[PDB]
Amino acid sequence: ASASKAAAFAQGGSSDPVPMPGKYPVVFSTGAGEPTRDQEFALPVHKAFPLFGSVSDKYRRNPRYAEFRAHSEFTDGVFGTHLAVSSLLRLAQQLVHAHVNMGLPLGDFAPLASSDVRIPSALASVVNQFGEFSSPSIGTRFLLRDFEHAVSRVVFLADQLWTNGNSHHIFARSWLPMSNNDGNFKTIVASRLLEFISAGDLSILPTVLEDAVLSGEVPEAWEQVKDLLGDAPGVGQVDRRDRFDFLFKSYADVGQFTTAFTTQAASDVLTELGLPWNSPSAGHLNWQYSTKQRFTFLADTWAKLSAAYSQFFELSSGLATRQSATGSHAQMVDLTSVEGVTVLKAALALSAPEFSLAACFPPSCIFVGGLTRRVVVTTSLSVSQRATEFCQMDWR
Amino acid sequence: LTSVEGVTVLKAALALSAPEFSLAACFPPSCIFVGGLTRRVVVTTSLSVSQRATEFCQMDWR
Amino acid sequence: LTSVEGVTVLKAALALSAPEFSLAACFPPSCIFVGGLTRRVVVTTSLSVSQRATEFCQMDWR
Amino acid sequence: ASASKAAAFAQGGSSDPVPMPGKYPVVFSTGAGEPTRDQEFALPVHKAFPLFGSVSDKYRRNPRYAEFRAHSEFTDGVFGTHLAVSSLLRLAQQLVHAHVNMGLPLGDFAPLASSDVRIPSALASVVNQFGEFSSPSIGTRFLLRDFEHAVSRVVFLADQLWTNGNSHHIFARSWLPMSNNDGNFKTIVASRLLEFISAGDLSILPTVLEDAVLSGEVPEAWEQVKDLLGDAPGVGQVDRRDRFDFLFKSYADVGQFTTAFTTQAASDVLTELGLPWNSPSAGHLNWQYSTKQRFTFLADTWAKLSAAYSQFFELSSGLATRQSATGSHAQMVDLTSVEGVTVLKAALALSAPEFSLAACFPPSCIFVGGLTRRVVVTTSLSVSQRATEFCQMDWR
Amino acid sequence: PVVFSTGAGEPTRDQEFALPVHKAFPLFGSVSDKYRRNPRYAEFRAHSEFTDGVFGTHLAVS
Numbered sequence: 001a002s003a004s005k006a007a008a009f010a011q012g013g014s015s016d017p018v019p020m021p022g023k024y025p026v027v028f029s030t031g032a033g034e035p036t037r038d039q040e041f042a043l044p045v046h047k048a049f050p051l052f053g054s055v056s057d058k059y060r061r062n063p064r065y066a067e068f069r070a071h072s073e074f075t076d077g078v079f080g081t082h083l084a085v086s087s088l089l090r091l092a093q094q095l096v097h098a099h100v101n102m103g104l105p106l107g108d109f110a111p112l113a114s115s116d117v118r119i120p121s122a123l124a125s126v127v128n129q130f131g132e133f134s135s136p137s138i139g140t141r142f143l144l145r146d147f148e149h150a151v152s153r154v155v156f157l158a159d160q161l162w163t164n165g166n167s168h169h170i171f172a173r174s175w176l177p178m179s180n181n182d183g184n185f186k187t188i189v190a191s192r193l194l195e196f197i198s199a200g201d202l203s204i205l206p207t208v209l210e211d212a213v214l215s216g217e218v219p220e221a222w223e224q225v226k227d228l229l230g231d232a233p234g235v236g237q238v239d240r241r242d243r244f245d246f247l248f249k250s251y252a253d254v255g256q257f258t259t260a261f262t263t264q265a266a267s268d269v270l271t272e273l274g275l276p277w278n279s280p281s282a283g284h285l286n287w288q289y290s291t292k293q294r295f296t297f298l299a300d301t302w303a304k305l306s307a308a309y310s311q312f313f314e315l316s317s318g319l320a321t322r323q324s325a326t327g328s329h330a331q332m333v334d335l336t337s338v339e340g341v342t343v344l345k346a347a348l349a350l351s352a353p354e355f356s357l358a359a360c361f362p363p364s365c366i367f368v369g370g371l372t373r374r375v376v377v378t379t380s381l382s383v384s385q386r387a388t389e390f391c392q393m394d395w396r
Numbered sequence: 397l398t399s400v401e402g403v404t405v406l407k408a409a410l411a412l413s414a415p416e417f418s419l420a421a422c423f424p425p426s427c428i429f430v431g432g433l434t435r436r437v438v439v440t441t442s443l444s445v446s447q448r449a450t451e452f453c454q455m456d457w458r
Numbered sequence: 459l460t461s462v463e464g465v466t467v468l469k470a471a472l473a474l475s476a477p478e479f480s481l482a483a484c485f486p487p488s489c490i491f492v493g494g495l496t497r498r499v500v501v502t503t504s505l506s507v508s509q510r511a512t513e514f515c516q517m518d519w520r
Numbered sequence: 521a522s523a524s525k526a527a528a529f530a531q532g533g534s535s536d537p538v539p540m541p542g543k544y545p546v547v548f549s550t551g552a553g554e555p556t557r558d559q560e561f562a563l564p565v566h567k568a569f570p571l572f573g574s575v576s577d578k579y580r581r582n583p584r585y586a587e588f589r590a591h592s593e594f595t596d597g598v599f600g601t602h603l604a605v606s607s608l609l610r611l612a613q614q615l616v617h618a619h620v621n622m623g624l625p626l627g628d629f630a631p632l633a634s635s636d637v638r639i640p641s642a643l644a645s646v647v648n649q650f651g652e653f654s655s656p657s658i659g660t661r662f663l664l665r666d667f668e669h670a671v672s673r674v675v676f677l678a679d680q681l682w683t684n685g686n687s688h689h690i691f692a693r694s695w696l697p698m699s700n701n702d703g704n705f706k707t708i709v710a711s712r713l714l715e716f717i718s719a720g721d722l723s724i725l726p727t728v729l730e731d732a733v734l735s736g737e738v739p740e741a742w743e744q745v746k747d748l749l750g751d752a753p754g755v756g757q758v759d760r761r762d763r764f765d766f767l768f769k770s771y772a773d774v775g776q777f778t779t780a781f782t783t784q785a786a787s788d789v790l791t792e793l794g795l796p797w798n799s800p801s802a803g804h805l806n807w808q809y810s811t812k813q814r815f816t817f818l819a820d821t822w823a824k825l826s827a828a829y830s831q832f833f834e835l836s837s838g839l840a841t842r843q844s845a846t847g848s849h850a851q852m853v854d855l856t857s858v859e860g861v862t863v864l865k866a867a868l869a870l871s872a873p874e875f876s877l878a879a880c881f882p883p884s885c886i887f888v889g890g891l892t893r894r895v896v897v898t899t900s901l902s903v904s905q906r907a908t909e910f911c912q913m914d915w916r
Numbered sequence: 917p918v919v920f921s922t923g924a925g926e927p928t929r930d931q932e933f934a935l936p937v938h939k940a941f942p943l944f945g946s947v948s949d950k951y952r953r954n955p956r957y958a959e960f961r962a963h964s965e966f967t968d969g970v971f972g973t974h975l976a977v978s
Contacts, residue, residue, distance in 0.1 A: 037597020039439025039464025081969040292968050302964045310437065340895045402501035408494030416498055420507045421514060422919065432470045436478065439464040441597030446815035447604055448483060450822045457823075463598060463808060511923060519928035 004386040016112025017365030020146025048135030055127035066325030067102035085317030099360040103326020118155035121283030144266025153280040159183020165260040173201030189230030217255040237276045330362030524906040534630035535887035540666025568655035573608045575647040586845030587622040608825030609836030619881030623846015638675035641803035648810045664782025665790040673800030679703025685780025693721030709747035741776045850883040
């Protein structure tokens with residue numbers, strides 16, 4: 001027990017990603033009150049009413065209230081121009097939030113986020129694209145759109161939700177994180193990944209080498225779709241993009257959609273039902289028309305469903321900022337069912353919440369950055385200094 | 397509003413008494429439509445009207 | 459009054475709360491032809507609106 | 521004393537069915553007060569008055585109050601909207617309940633289950649079908665309708681009350697539980713049971729193989745009637761459905777449905793009179809017209825049954841939620857009478873109730889499930905570790 | 917027009933008549949409060965009405 005310039009430092013450094021999964025569908029299946037008889041069945045319909053209770057809290061008042069802003073994140077009003085409170089936040093939100101709360105431990109060393117200027121923009125879109133069209137496209141379709149990492153405005157975290165695919169297939173092939181950038185760019189998607197990180201690892205995971213038959217499927221197509229996603233979706237809008245995103249997510253590529261996620265009901269349905277701009281300025285008009293209509297749908301919420309005052313379960317959003325929004329080790333998806341469940345994986349989460357997570361196993365497509373920057377200058381203790389000092393105790 | 401020699405503040409909306417008549421400065425008017433609505437919404441998944449009926453009915457018998 | 463699965467009793471006029479739910483066991487009176495009338499009349503042979511305004515105005519000058 | 525990661529966990533999991541037997545008839549024969557002389561006989565009819573005295577309690581207030589709701593099964597008020605009570609529950613109800621309370625032991629490992637969205641639906645019907653039309657069809661007919669596992673709305677636990685018949689005759693054959701789902705399906709008869717689980721076990725239990733005489737009179741029709749129940753009752757109503765079912769439950773089929781079925785009368789009389797909807801359509805309207813009327817008839821319990829003010833024996837159904845409704849092995853009937861009465865109880869039920877709970881009740885045809893999920897993750901003590909340790913106490 | 921006719925202080929002599937014109941000065945005192953800070957401060961927002969900043973981007977006091 002000797003002494004050489006000690007301290008105690010806290011840190012934060014890592015990445016985070018999110019997905020739109022069939023998870024919401026399990027949370028909006030209408031289990032929450034469909035079988036509740038408080039003759040509230042006076043007021044019509046209850047199909048979308050429940051589902052739509054998903055957004056308007058899980059993206060602005062819950063997560064973007066403490067996670068975003070507090071994350072050393074000086075947020076611009078015009079993305080929170082309207083701090084919202086929807087008492088409809090069933091047992092899923094204060095729960096959901098705890099479930100999905102952007103933030104990792106400090107006793108460890110991680111954090112979350114990569115594009116909250118593009119993600120939300122899309123989410124809002126989805127809430128509108130979904131909570132406006134036909135509320136429940138039965139898994140197939142709506143789920144596709146959301147898990148299809150739908151068309152972008154050039155930023156979209158997509159590339160990550162897509163990176164999932166390629167990696168899974170290439171067993172032996174382990175890629176340098178650089179592959180995480182492949183999302184956008186022209187050539188570098190046909191040199192780094194596709195050619196080098198393919199004619200190398202691709203020429204192995206499936207070395208068809210077919211002759212006079214065009215390497216259809218068998219890696220070479222996923223790469224093409226990859227090459228596409230590189231040059232043919234970043235050149236702008238127009239059918240040339242959808243049609244050639246769709247062509248790349250539609251036909252011939254029926255083998256490329258099998259890797260990731262897809263149904264001829266997302267693409268030919270959703271995709272042919274959104275107008276490429278359904279992700280770009282839709283993401284805008286969904287914030288300055290849909291967010292103001294979010295109002296209507298929120299006020300409608302704080303007016304209609306509010307009327308659900310007569311049951312006695314809901315509560316209101318009383319501004320976090322004190323409530324916070326980070327802490328849950330949503331890291332590494334805790335799921336594995338076989339006769340009996342099995343919550344697994346790294347992220348020494350908790351014990352009281354863990355197992356309570358059944359309602360919702362939060363999952364941020366995190367990258368994970370083993371970083372504990374115990375940065376230390378020694379303009380006062382040239383390592384050696386200590387050395388003699390300590391050395392001068394083993395002598396006597 | 398209704399003036400004839402002397403004023404006459406009229407009409408439904410059991411407003412107030414202290415402000416009413418003080419309103420001279422400005423008789424506020426919202427082109428309202430008015431919706432006679434008192435939604436005493438009531439589910440009875442615990443008291444099929446009848447239930448009460450016998451209960452009460454079972455007091456007029458004795 | 460309306461009955462569907464459960465019994466809902468909407469009462470246009472803010473009636474009561476102790477009788478309401480008790481007074482559904484049978485009665486719910488006739489077809490009145492409501493008359494929105496709150497005759498809050500007011501002669502002005504004492505305070506020609508100007509006088510008031512003239513006064514109140516004398517507290518918005520200084 | 522080797523210990524290694526012990527615990528102690530309690531569970532629940534198993535089946536449970538129910539039947540409408542001549543059992544009720546023994547409980548409503550009018551032996552509870554027919555000979556009582558208090559001059560209560562003030563110009564009144566006491567035929568149905570007794571029989572219909574247990575209905576409104578043995579299915580909502582008694583069983584569904586704790587059994588159902590507490591069984592962790594999210595109940596909809598519109599199946600218990602009128603959580604009313606009935607004080608006419610003489611000595612048969614608080615008794616009956618204890619006689620038929622669904623909830624096997626945990627010290628063992630079983631529970632209750634078999635569509636409480638269809639059973640009650642039909643029961644309420646019977647209550648109406650019986651307690652309204654013919655209040656005492658003299659065993660033959662009403663008991664039939666009850667036991668006949670009467671027409672369904674596609675669900676009905678009939679399939680099980682019917683499976684009791686095809687397994688009884690087939691001694692040489694035993695079947696895989698997969699024969700339980702034998703209820704509905706267009707193939708149940710053209711595949712598994714009927715053909716395979718018949719051309720194999722049926723071609724032995726009755727291998728007539730008759731020529732130019734059509735072999736149906738030899739339990740190949742039981743397969744046919746089975747066939748029918750497979751394709752001809754699930755195709756809707758078409759009235760003939762009764763005609764068919766009836767045909768299959770009558771016209772010559774009499775030699776078919778007499779292995780585990782009642783008198784055809786309860787089919788042409790009851791069924792035909794009732795009108796195929798008197799099991800699906802009736803149930804609903806019997807739950808939202810008859811359950812409301814259940815009150816008009818509950819009034820019969822709290823007005824007609826209430827008029828019993830002076831005799832002083834009645835006063836049942838005070839609580840619920842707290843009184844519970846599960847924990848009596850009134851299951852595996854296993855009762856036999858010869859000179860003396862012997863009551864064999866497969867499951868170690870009780871000793872104070874047993875011998876007391878033979879006065880009438882001995883619940884349905886459960887399909888036991890030997891299940892004691894004593895699961896145990898091994899991410900702490902890889903068997904070797906333990907063995908490695910214990911072994912370190914067998915070396916020295 | 918009856919509220920901006922200039923009754924409020926036109927006949928008030930506090931030699932404030934040093935500073936020119938007083939025609940629109942009074943009338944224009946009508947808005948900038950009766951539509952954002954007065955009514956849209958509690959009525960709008962509180963009316964279960966989650967308002968967008970860009971209509972109250974500037975909460976005013978006159």
